[PDB]
Write an enzyme that holds these catalytic residues in place. Structure first.
Site, PDB file in Angstrom:
ATOM      1  N   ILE A  11       0.824  -1.206   0.000  1.00 47.89           N
ATOM      2  CA  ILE A  11       0.000   0.000   0.000  1.00 47.89           C
ATOM      3  C   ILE A  11       0.860   1.259   0.000  1.00 47.89           C
ATOM      4  O   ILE A  11       0.854   2.023  -0.965  1.00 47.89           O
ATOM      5  CB  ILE A  11      -0.949   0.042   1.214  1.00 47.89           C
ATOM      6  CG1 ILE A  11      -0.152   0.005   2.518  1.00 47.89           C
ATOM      7  CG2 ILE A  11      -1.937  -1.116   1.163  1.00 47.89           C
ATOM      8  CD1 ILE A  11      -1.017   0.055   3.763  1.00 47.89           C
ATOM      9  N   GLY A  12       8.648  -0.438  -2.766  1.00 40.94           N
ATOM     10  CA  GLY A  12       7.383  -0.168  -2.107  1.00 40.94           C
ATOM     11  C   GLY A  12       7.140   1.315  -1.902  1.00 40.94           C
ATOM     12  O   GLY A  12       6.645   1.999  -2.797  1.00 40.94           O
ATOM     13  N   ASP A  13       7.493   1.817  -0.722  1.00 39.38           N
ATOM     14  CA  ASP A  13       8.091   0.992   0.322  1.00 39.38           C
ATOM     15  C   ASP A  13       7.150   0.812   1.511  1.00 39.38           C
ATOM     16  O   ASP A  13       7.569   0.377   2.584  1.00 39.38           O
ATOM     17  CB  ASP A  13       9.417   1.597   0.785  1.00 39.38           C
ATOM     18  CG  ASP A  13      10.547   1.346  -0.196  1.00 39.38           C
ATOM     19  OD1 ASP A  13      10.649   0.210  -0.705  1.00 39.38           O
ATOM     20  OD2 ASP A  13      11.331   2.284  -0.459  1.00 39.38           O
ATOM     21  N   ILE A  14       5.878   1.143   1.314  1.00 40.25           N
ATOM     22  CA  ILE A  14       4.868   0.962   2.353  1.00 40.25           C
ATOM     23  C   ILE A  14       4.027  -0.281   2.085  1.00 40.25           C
ATOM     24  O   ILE A  14       3.483  -0.449   0.992  1.00 40.25           O
ATOM     25  CB  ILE A  14       3.933   2.181   2.459  1.00 40.25           C
ATOM     26  CG1 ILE A  14       4.726   3.443   2.804  1.00 40.25           C
ATOM     27  CG2 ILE A  14       2.855   1.931   3.504  1.00 40.25           C
ATOM     28  CD1 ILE A  14       4.955   3.639   4.286  1.00 40.25           C
ATOM     29  N   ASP A 119       7.499  19.843   4.188  1.00 41.56           N
ATOM     30  CA  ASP A 119       6.977  19.151   3.012  1.00 41.56           C
ATOM     31  C   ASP A 119       5.563  19.638   2.724  1.00 41.56           C
ATOM     32  O   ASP A 119       5.296  20.174   1.649  1.00 41.56           O
ATOM     33  CB  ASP A 119       6.996  17.633   3.209  1.00 41.56           C
ATOM     34  CG  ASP A 119       7.143  16.877   1.902  1.00 41.56           C
ATOM     35  OD1 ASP A 119       6.899  17.476   0.836  1.00 41.56           O
ATOM     36  OD2 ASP A 119       7.508  15.682   1.940  1.00 41.56           O
TER      37      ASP A 119
HETATM   38  N1  LIG Z   1      -4.056   6.820   1.400  1.00 39.91           N
HETATM   39  C1  LIG Z   1      -2.717   6.406   1.124  1.00 39.91           C
HETATM   40  C2  LIG Z   1      -2.252   5.452   2.195  1.00 39.91           C
HETATM   41  N2  LIG Z   1      -0.944   5.821   2.603  1.00 39.91           N
HETATM   42  S1  LIG Z   1       0.066   4.656   3.186  1.00 39.91           S
HETATM   43  O1  LIG Z   1      -0.641   3.443   3.503  1.00 39.91           O
HETATM   44  O2  LIG Z   1       0.978   4.208   2.163  1.00 39.91           O
HETATM   45  C3  LIG Z   1       0.933   5.292   4.593  1.00 39.91           C
HETATM   46  C4  LIG Z   1       2.099   5.884   4.134  1.00 39.91           C
HETATM   47  C5  LIG Z   1       2.979   6.480   5.031  1.00 39.91           C
HETATM   48  C6  LIG Z   1       2.678   6.473   6.387  1.00 39.91           C
HETATM   49 CL1  LIG Z   1       3.862   7.251   7.402  1.00 39.91          CL
HETATM   50  C7  LIG Z   1       1.487   5.867   6.850  1.00 39.91           C
HETATM   51  C8  LIG Z   1       1.194   5.866   8.208  1.00 39.91           C
HETATM   52  C9  LIG Z   1       0.018   5.266   8.654  1.00 39.91           C
HETATM   53  N3  LIG Z   1      -0.850   4.680   7.761  1.00 39.91           N
HETATM   54  C10 LIG Z   1      -0.547   4.689   6.425  1.00 39.91           C
HETATM   55  C11 LIG Z   1       0.635   5.290   5.966  1.00 39.91           C
END
Ligand SMILES: NCCNS(=O)(=O)c1ccc(Cl)c2ccncc12
Length: 330
Positions: A11, A12-14, A119
């Protein structure tokens, strides 16, 4: 895999992750040691110092997993840009004001904790998953720097000729000039975002370039050629007043946060708005529960008080009462 939450869907690097201990949902990121210029651990430290405040993501665990270092946060729902898209890239004045109000307090808190985000994009504002789905949270402190020393409260010295970070569309004018970023620049970026929510666009986005620097310079030229009252072309007095104050702040100068808070709150009171925490996407989703151009027309007829909009051709300063006549229309 990993320690000790299991990562899943990207949802990378997430990645989407699962807490094996409880079942709680987790947003987990891992950086790529050692390239290029990784900074994740530092960001985790920033989170740790900022914790305790509202709208601050909670780091469950940070460490080094296998090869890559990993940071772990609880899930925080969609960004304000995703909700922006969900509402066809336009927010009602009620939503914009309410978002501006919470954003003020969040950014104020960060500045109170001697830091600056640097940012400030809609992508960096996430709502939340559950009960905290009305609150606004702040993310990505990878570019954040502390502006005042902690005990002495002495401001960092004036510097120039440095590069800009990181997104030009919402970037401050001073940042384009290579000026060291202060609190004022966070607030100016915030103002750009608010206009971005009202109009749905900025005069400098969608330009032509052959290189990053040429791109930045062209955005820089457009920003300089655009007046303050010109970009607030169909927006109330308070919108111009905000941008005027923010751009006229000294480097060392701290903002009068209550002044800008009262600025938007009084505008809200003039418009007979309330902190219902009922946003555009909220009522749109509700009406859809029962393209989407139809649903929007329906939601307005259901809640005529809430939905007031900006007209793209208008070069005007709409009086509170003038806008309040968009209520009797719906
Ligand atoms: N709506 C896009 C979702 N963003 S996400 O899941 O990639 C996401 C990216 C970065 C951070 Cl720091 C998060 C923190 C908590 N939840 C989702 C987070």
């Amino acid at each position: 895999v990993g320690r000790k939450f299991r990562i899943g869907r990207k949802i990378g690097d997430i990645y989407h992750g699962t807490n094996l201990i409880s079942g709680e949902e987790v947003a987990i990121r891992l950086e790529s040691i050692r390239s290029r210029h990784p900074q994740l651990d530092y960001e985790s430290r920033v989170y740790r110092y900022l914790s305790g405040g509202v709208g601050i993501p909670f780091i469950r665990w940070f460490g080094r997993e296998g090869e890559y270092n990993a940071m772990v946060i609880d899930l925080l729902g969609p960004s304000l840009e995703d909700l922006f898209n969900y509402c066809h890239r336009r927010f009602s004045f009620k939503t914009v004001i309410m978002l501006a109000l919470q954003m003020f307090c969040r950014i104020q808190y960060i500045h109170g904790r001697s830091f600056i985000h640097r940012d400030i994009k809609p992508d960096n504002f996430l709502m939340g998953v559950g009960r905290r789905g009305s609150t606004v949270h702040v993310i990505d402190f990878g570019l954040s720097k502390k502006y005042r020393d902690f005990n002495t409260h002495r401001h960092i010295p004036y510097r120039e000729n440095k590069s800009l970070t990181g997104t030009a569309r919402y970037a401050s004018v001073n940042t384009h000039l290579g000026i060291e970023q202060s609190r004022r620049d966070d607030l100016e970026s915030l103002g750009y975002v608010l206009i971005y929510f009202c109009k749905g666009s900025l005069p400098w986005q969608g330009l032509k370039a052959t290189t990053k620097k040429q791109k930045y310079d062209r955005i820089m030229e457009k920003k300089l050629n655009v007046s303050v009252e010109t970009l607030c072309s169909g927006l109330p007095l308070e919108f111009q007043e905000y941008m005027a104050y923010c751009k006229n702040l000294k480097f060392d100068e701290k903002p009068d946060y209550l002044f800008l808070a009262r600025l938007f709150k009084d505008l809200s009171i003039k418009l007979e708005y309330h902190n219902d925490h009922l946003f555009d996407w909220t009522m749109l989703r509700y009406t859809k529960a029962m393209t989407f151009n139809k649903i929007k027309l329906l939601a307005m007829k259901k809640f005529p008080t809430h939905f007031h909009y900006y007209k793209n051709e208008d070069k005007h300063n709409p009086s509170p009462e003038e806008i309040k006549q968009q209520t009797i229309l719906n």
